[PDB]
Amino acid sequence: MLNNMLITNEIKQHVDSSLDNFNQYILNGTPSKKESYNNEVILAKQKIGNLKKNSDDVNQYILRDLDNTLDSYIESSKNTISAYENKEGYVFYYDDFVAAKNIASYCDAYASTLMQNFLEA
Amino acid sequence: PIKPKIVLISHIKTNPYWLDIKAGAERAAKERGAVVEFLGPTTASTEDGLKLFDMATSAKVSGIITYVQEEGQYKKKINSAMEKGIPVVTIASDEEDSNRIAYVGTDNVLAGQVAGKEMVKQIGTSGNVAIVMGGKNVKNQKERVEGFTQYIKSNSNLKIVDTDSSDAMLLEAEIITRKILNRNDNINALFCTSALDGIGAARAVKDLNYKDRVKIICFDDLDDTLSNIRNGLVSATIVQKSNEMGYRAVNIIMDKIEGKSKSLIDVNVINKSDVD
Amino acid sequence: KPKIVLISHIKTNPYWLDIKAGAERAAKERGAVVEFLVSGIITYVYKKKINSAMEKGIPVVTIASDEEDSNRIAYVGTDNVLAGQVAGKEMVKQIGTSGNVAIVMGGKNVKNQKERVEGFTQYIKSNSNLKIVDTDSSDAMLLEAEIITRKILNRNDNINALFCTSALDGIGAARAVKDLNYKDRVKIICFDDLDDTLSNIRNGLVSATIVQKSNEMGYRAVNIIMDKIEGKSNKKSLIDVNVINKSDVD
């Protein structure tokens, strides 16, 4: 009941925290935040999993969209990272960069939608 | 058990036209074992629309049905959804320079033929008819004229009177109708190729005292047009079938999905009977 | 004024009186006179009767039945593919877009029935999720009509409608639906307007029929002759159909 809302915010925070670390890494180059970023998406990814093994018939749809949006996020943020690491310029990964944060906020939109759902009897 | 998700992005999410589209979309979804998520901006907005498309693409939904708010502005996102294996169907408004799997909208040539049939039903097979055409070079209006003209020529001896619409500075419908009626003393009917043309023609027919001497057939269901029909001023109007457009779009998506892989829709006729 | 001769089926049928009315209407508009049983001939079905009539630079238009061999100037008859689509649309209007439908088809290889089926099928497939149930017609052995409709309704439990590709098929399907006590549980759509077909529509047994537009065929035939005569060609030409359901039977 509340556990379910609880973990949703953890998911949302992990995604948030992942994007923060991801931005910092692309800007600064600190190899510690790149790994924090990858820790956070794994935890996000993991906790979405637990919510899914006990899905409603309704929120299983929100959860699938959330899970898939995260994957898109992961993919664009890793293409952003990939480009940056064989040193291409900002104009050649700007495109995956903003996509990464666009998609990061999409995850956040599904997260809230998922939590509003968990308001139930 | 989880059903494929189709996203439907409308012009306005509150517009009843697009709610008709949603109902039809839902009917096909229920028949095909899918679910439809109906999205759309409150205010008409290419940006709001494009954002919704982007989220739909990111959520890897099984297919996207979208309204195009500005031509040219959608070809990148569409081709990118298509590239990630998401079938995209454009609805009512097309992005023709794209990899859109299909466009679903009114068959304008057919809609013209239906107008032709209705006019012959209104005034018979002999007499004179004139066309009131706002956009002389607009494709859907050219298509309406082409359908109309072909039907008339093949099923009647009605002469179609031609009028240059240049004076009128590419012309307000009230002004061009005055010209048609003032130059020609024996016009039995007007065929109006857009919704505004119908309103202008009806006003001009009324102002020149020709109500019910000149029948009018037009397009679209605006309040004035429906009021003109109850009132004997406008004989018939040709209306788009929204519900069916939503219905057809889902079935096209589901066909692509299930690998069973068109696509213009019919119209209805409203004359005084069905005005309710 | 040019004189046009109209050779009918016989002057026995109200159809061919409709043809005359349409013929006459076009004749008045185009400035001709029509003789119903010279400048031109319109006929019901012949090859070289047509061709030495034609050999005299005399236009011949065949109507309803086509004599495709001849040098007839044009054929005027029903657009059967279109007629099938109209049947589809009326079908969707009668039972909605989900459910089961079966076809009762006398001539599997008769052109107009094939066209009707191709139109019906294309429409059904593009405008609904109606399933078309297939039935092997071998044991009905070629196949009556009442007997094949029995197999269809007895083998399949949830047939919502029958599409009958001819008039006889319609009469046979209607009888079988009645005999198996499925009236108003199974809708029927067919072709052609026979008295039996019209009573069945009045009685709620047959839902709709698609009928040829006789008046327009005669109207069109005259305008085609006169075009040829006045050389203002403008030279086939297939005609639309009407739908008779319970409302407009009267």
Description:
The PDB classes it as sugar binding protein. The complex is a heterotrimer, with 1 copy of chain A (121 residues) and 2 copies of chain B. Chain A has one domain (1-121). Chain A starts with a helix and ends with a helix. Chain A is elongated, with a radius of gyration of 15 Å. Chain A has 121 residues and is an all-alpha fold. Chain A has helices at residues 2-28, 31-52, 59-85, 94-117. Chain B is built from 9 helices and 12 strands. In chain B, helix 2 packs parallel to helix 3 (75-83). Chain B is an alpha/beta fold and 276 residues long. In chain B, strand 3 (63-66), helix 3 (75-83) and strand 4 form a beta-alpha-beta unit. The B-C interface holds B 27-28, 31-32, 117, 125-126, 154-155, 157, 244, 247-248, 251, 262, 266 and C 25-26, 29-30, 89, 97-98, 126-127, 129, 216, 219-220, 223, 237, 240.
List keywords for this structure.
heterotrimer, A: 121 residues, mainly alpha, 83% helix, elongated, B: alpha/beta, 2 domains, 6-stranded parallel beta sheet, 6-stranded mixed beta sheet, 19% strand
Topology:
The complex is a heterotrimer, with one copy of chain A (121 residues) and two copies of chain B.
Chain A: H1 2-28, H2 31-52, H3 59-85, H4 94-117
Helix pairs in contact in A: 1-2, 1-4, 2-3, 3-4
Chain B: E1 5-9, H1 16-32, E2 35-39, H2 46-58, E3 63-66, H3 75-83, E4 88-91, E5 102-106, H4 108-123, E6 128-132, H5 139-155, E7 159-161, H6 173-183, E8 189-192, H7 195-207, E9 215-219, H8 223-230, E10 236-240, H9 242-257, E11 264-265, E12 267-271
Parallel strand pairs in B: 1-2, 1-3, 3-4, 4-5, 5-11, 6-7, 6-8, 8-9, 9-10
Antiparallel strand pairs in B: 10-12
Helix pairs in contact in B: 1-9, 2-3, 4-5, 6-7
PDB class: sugar binding protein
Keywords: Two component system, histidine kinase, signal transmission across the membrane, D-xylose uptake, sugar binding protein
Assembly: trimeric
